[PDB]
């Protein structure tokens, strides 16, 4: 109103029939921290129709980016799927979220554990110089059902290591670990199963989580997150907050409404 900026769509790409990304302009007033979410959506019948969305773009990029589900009868995404370049969206002005470095004690390895659209905030974090200064390795796990749901997989593997500003840090420090559950692919499984078997650690070449070295951000389905939270706490890791830095922090990629 006043609670929103209007932005224009500058590009759009559909990954699958349930996943798409788009880029927009960015109001010069807008600021956020990598990992945060805002309310995004459309003016519908002169009223805002908005939903929580992670900001997928890099923190000082002159533009915004969203990585979105398409839910066929979802009030927002049943509309938002039909976006075209030039269309208007609205974006709220007060970012929030728990996916923040300072909610974590200092460490050596940051594991970004995601399913589905829960990759979104991590697309911002892995484009933040700050993360590479704070952590010697950043391990991005992205778990999906189908190989075509590995949104950004060519960008992450092939383009991002060539970035002028981030490329050498990414070549040296980012370990990208896509995994698929329901189609043939070189890496298969749920990240829960891959942690319990030890397979994750063997494949990325790092030791099993330890209290001194390893920190985690989790973003994905409620079920993944409840199960992975139990895994980490059984291993002695504690949830961080702003008042008390811990070893992991959690954000839902969506809620079952
Ligand atoms: C902190 C937070 C951040 C979020 N960030 C994102 C984001 O970056 N991208 C995004 O696409 N959504 C994200 N969501 C989900 C988003 O808020 C909306 O639910 C989504 O835009 C769909 O809106 P809708 O009105 O079409 O359907 P809704 O009525 O909101 O959702 C209906 C149902 O669709 C399913 N659902 C909704 N969102 C998702 C999803 N992302 N993945 C899988 N299933 C889903 C659930 O079954 C849900 O009950 C986030 C939610 C939270 C709480
Ligand atoms: N938390 C929930 O309530 C939840 C969870 C998943 C799906 N869904 C339903 O399915 C739709 C799509 O969900 P989605 O975007 O999460 O996509 P999805 O394609 O259902 O799942 C994404 C990836 O997460 C894995 N996964 C599922 N449960 C997990 C767990 N407990 N721990 C670790 N990984 C797990 C999946 O493995 P598998 O192939 O083995 O399932 C898959 O590889 C939702 O909109 C909703 O209707 C709900």
């Amino acid at each position: 109103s006043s609670n929103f900026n209007q932005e224009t769509v500058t590009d759009i790409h559909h990954w699958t029939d349930t996943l798409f990304s788009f880029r927009t302009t960015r109001d010069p007033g807008f600021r956020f921290q990598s990992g945060q979410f805002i309310m995004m959506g459309l003016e519908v019948n002169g009223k805002p129709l908005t939903r929580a969305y992670s900001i997928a773009s890099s923190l000082y990029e002159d533009g915004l980016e969203f990585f979105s589900i398409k839910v066929p009868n979802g009030p927002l995404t049943s509309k938002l799927q039909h976006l075209k370049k030039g269309d208007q969206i609205i974006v709220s002005k007060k970012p929030v979220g728990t996916l923040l470095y300072d909610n974590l004690k200092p460490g050596k390895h940051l594991w970004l554990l995601s399913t589905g659209t829960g990759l979104a905030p991590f697309l911002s974090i892995i484009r933040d110089l700050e993360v590479y200064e704070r952590f010697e390795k950043v391990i991005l796990v992205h778990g999906v059902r189908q190989v075509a749901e590995l949104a950004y997989t060519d960008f992450i593997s092939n383009e991002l290591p060539q970035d002028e500003f981030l490329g050498e840090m990414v070549k040296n420090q980012l370990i990208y670990y896509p995994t698929v559950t329901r189609e043939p692919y070189k890496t298969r499984g749920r990240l829960t199963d891959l942690i319990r078997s030890g397979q994750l650690f063997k494949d990325v070449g790092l030791p099993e989580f330890n209290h001194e070295d390893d920190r985690m951000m989790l973003c994905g389905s409620p079920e993944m997150l409840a199960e992975t939270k139990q895994i980490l706490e059984e291993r002695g890791f504690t949830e961080g907050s702003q008042s008390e830095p811990g070893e992991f922090v959690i954000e839902k990629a969506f809620v079952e409404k």
Side-chain angles (χ1 to χ4, degrees), residues 18-19 69-71 114-118 142-146 149 179-183 189-193 196 220-228 231 253-257:
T18 64
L19 294 167
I69 200 63
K70 301 177 276 176
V71 179
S114 71
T115 56
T117 61
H142 186 218
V144 302
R145 283 184 215 184
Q146 304 174 0
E149 299 173 332
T179 186
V180 177
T181 46
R182 304 197 198 186
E183 291 185 335
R190 295 184 173 186
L191 70 82
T192 46
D193 297 328
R196 291 183 212 278
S221 62
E223 292 166 332
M224 176 286 291
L225 292 174
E227 185 178 350
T228 310
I231 291 173
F254 62 96
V255 312
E256 286 295 300
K257 298 181 182 182

Side-chain angles (χ1 to χ4, degrees), residues 34-102:
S34 324
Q36 288 184 310
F37 71 87
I38 36 69
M39 303 299 284
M40 181 278 281
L42 293 167
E43 176 183 348
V44 172
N45 294 141
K47 281 176 260 194
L49 176 66
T50 67
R51 292 290 176 262
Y53 267 85
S54 293
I55 304 158
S57 46
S58 186
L59 88 169
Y60 307 126
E61 178 66 30
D62 181 25
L64 298 169
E65 188 165 9
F66 303 102
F67 175 36
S68 189
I69 200 63
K70 301 177 276 176
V71 179
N73 273 64
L76 177 56
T77 66
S78 62
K79 297 167 187 60
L80 200 71
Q81 64 189 156
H82 300 303
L83 279 170
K84 295 185 173 177
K85 287 183 58 165
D87 285 353
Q88 309 293 282
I89 69 153
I90 48 173
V91 177
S92 72
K93 289 180 200 196
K94 295 186 154 168
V96 299
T98 55
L99 307 174
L100 302 177
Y101 315 123
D102 287 342

